[PDB]
Amino acid sequence: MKVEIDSFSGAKIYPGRGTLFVRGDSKIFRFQNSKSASLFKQRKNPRRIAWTVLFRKHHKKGI
Template sequence: MVINTELCALSEYRIYPGNGKLMIRRDGRPIWLGTSKAYGLTVQRKKAAKLVWTQAWRRLHKKGISETASKKRTRRVGKVQRAVVGASLEDIKKKAAQKSEIRKDAKEAAIKELKDRKAANKAKSGGAKGKVAKPHTFQKVPKHMGGASKRAGTQR
């Protein structure tokens, strides 16, 4: 539940419902006064900035500011995982959970494929330009040698 409170014009303390006095000046400006102390001092035309116990004086002399500043510094923004366009939150989590090796393999495979494709493209374009390809020099493959089969070693 939110309670509507006013601020005392002199001390700047909160005024809860049922407390305080509302003085309205000739010019129509309302002045809330929380206590008889505040009222008495206002009638005496005392300045809030010259009374040590008021918030105005404390603000002027920079009291209690360092605590609030240090508190602010500790506050940090936490990282939040969120779904990005085209990738849901689950997909992202799954990818992050995968082992680095698998990811590395996948990456290499992808690069290899890309290279192959590039090479193929190059060959095609090269062929179209009419570059004379070197005639294949067939190496004479020796026919089955008798000794080869007899050789001991790898058997398939």
């Protein structure tokens, strides 16, 4: 087996836990949770969301 990375939060997705999405352009996204999923459908930016790994690494926290 393997573990993966939420498009939004960038989190380990242990098997089965979480949702998957396949846009018409064949981009396969994965979501650990409906929180991330709903934000994605809202077309939010994780780099702006604070608790996200992208914001974390863009503001240079936990270096």
